Write a protein that binds this ligand. Structure first.
Ligand SMILES: *[C@@H]1O[C@H](CO)[C@@H](O[C@@H]2O[C@H](CO)[C@@H](O[C@@H]3O[C@H](CO[C@H]4O[C@H](CO)[C@@H](O)[C@H](O)[C@@H]4O)[C@@H](O)[C@H](O)[C@@H]3O)[C@H](O)[C@H]2NC(C)=O)[C@H](O)[C@H]1NC(C)=O
Ligand SMILES: *[C@@H]1O[C@H](CO)[C@@H](O[C@@H]2O[C@H](CO)[C@@H](O[C@@H]3O[C@H](CO[C@H]4O[C@H](CO)[C@@H](O)[C@H](O)[C@@H]4O)[C@@H](O)[C@H](O)[C@@H]3O)[C@H](O)[C@H]2NC(C)=O)[C@H](O)[C@H]1NC(C)=O
Ligand SMILES: *[C@@H]1O[C@H](CO)[C@@H](O)[C@H](O)[C@H]1NC(C)=O
Ligand SMILES: *[C@@H]1O[C@H](CO)[C@@H](O)[C@H](O)[C@H]1NC(C)=O
Lengths: 200, 200
């Protein structure tokens, strides 16, 4: 740049320039015109808006032209007082984002078993403590095979969000049956079991 | 990214990343970690400083590692409540500057001439009005040749900064002399003159 010569009482243009990326949008652009030496503010374009002229009320941008990278300032009704160096600061912000999901877990304790002590309906109870998230519960006999029966299973969360699972199987008996509870944590893939065996 | 699995009561790390330019410095970087859905603030690094953890007091950056582009966040003493998606916003600011100097000008009016009316010391007076900046003043005879003599020249600025120049030449007379004043504006390179001619 050479200096800009302006007749007193006329309007003048102070050049400034940038090269915008194809992405570009004015919400990115942050633009300050300042008196070089003092660093007093003259005109600003920030946060997708054209703020005013700061003190003068005699300055303007070419708001239709910014997006194309013209940050030149227009100074009106020039006067001796305006003489000096002006500095144009142009900051473009490129914002990127990434997301990350946190999955929380806790293990369930070894279950504790309970019943009402051979063609009779009896109830077995599986209780396992303080795991997260909700567990998958499986009842099965001693050779891995699902037990038939009515099972009620509830899972109750404490103050800290952790679950205690309480699962109740009502069965009719067979003289030699083992009965098992597997409490699974899907997320950790940890398995907890207990089992009663009934002969007599 | 896959999701991050954290045992309750342990510490976990949420990854985030950037690729910095060789220029790069932390005063450029603006960094927000937010709960994706709510958009509540978790942790920020702005204006060359690491602001705190926002609400939790359980979060940290790796401040020694930012400059290399690691914006990962450390979450401490994890709990069910923390479960969710987190979003990391990374804005880098590249600031450029240019300076432009405004040189103001105004033209001087045609000078007006005055004297005390042939081997006598007389005084001629050049007055020119409202120019800017200070002018160069030249006294000369009628064939372009500098006049010898004592010249006093003063330049006085009005309310608006503009100069009136008043230049006084004291000469001894020669029976046939033309006397001239050239008032020059260096900046505009406009010349203003007046002249008296003296026969009798
Ligand atoms: C940013 O956009 C600006 C807004 O359009 C551009 O400004 C324009 O620039 C063009 C090309 O250089 C100028 O065209 C020239 O204008 C002069 C007229 O004389 C000057 O004096 C009057 C005062 O009476 C004042 O209005 C201006 O300062 C004038 O420049 C002609 O002699 C030339 O032949 C030619 O037509 C436009 O005048 C100018 N417009 C304004 C309002 O300044 C600028 O070029 C762009 N900058 C960048 C970096 O891209
Ligand atoms: C940003 O910088 C981070 C700070 O150093 C980097 O984090 C480090 O990443 C390395 C490489 O992947 C990890 O090394 C692995 O760590 C695990 C240890 O188990 C995890 O569990 C404990 C909880 O008890 C917890 O401290 C962490 O979440 C652990 O990751 C090992 O099994 C691996 O073999 C290997 O050693 C560092 O542990 C990790 N440090 C921390 C504090 O997280 C990160 O890689 C950088 N990110 C980017 C984008 O560059
Ligand atoms: C600047 O302009 C506003 C109108 O937008 C006006 O209210 C204010 O008084 C002006 N200030 C000066 C110093 O001219
Ligand atoms: C966060 O930490 C500051 C100490 O830096 C402490 O004064 C403030 O009470 C903390 N807030 C919470 C909610 O723990």
């Amino acid at each position: 740049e050479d200096p800009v010569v302006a007749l007193v009482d006329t309007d003048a243009t102070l050049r400034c320039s940038f090269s915008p990326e194809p992405g570009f949008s004015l919400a990115q652009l942050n633009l300050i015109w300042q008196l070089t030496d003092t660093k007093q503010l003259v005109h600003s374009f920030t946060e997708g808006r054209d703020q005013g002229s700061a003190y003068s009320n005699r300055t303007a941008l070419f708001p239709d032209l910014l997006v194309q990278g013209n940050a030149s300032l227009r100074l009106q009704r020039v006067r001796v007082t305006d003489e000096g160096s002006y500095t144009c600061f142009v900051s473009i912000q490129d914002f990127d984002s990434a997301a990350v999901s946190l999955q929380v877990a806790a293990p369930y304790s070894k279950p504790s078993m309970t019943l009402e002590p051979p063609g009779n309906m009896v109830t077995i109870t599986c209780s396992s403590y303080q795991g997260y998230p909700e567990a998958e519960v499986f009842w099965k006999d001693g050779q891995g095979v699902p037990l038939t029966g009515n099972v009620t299973t509830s899972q109750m969360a404490n103050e800290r969000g952790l679950f205690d699972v309480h699962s109740v199987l009502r069965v009719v008996l067979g003289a030699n049956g083992t009965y098992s509870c597997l409490v699974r944590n899907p997320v950790l893939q940890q398995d907890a079991h207990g089992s009663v065996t009934i002969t007599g």
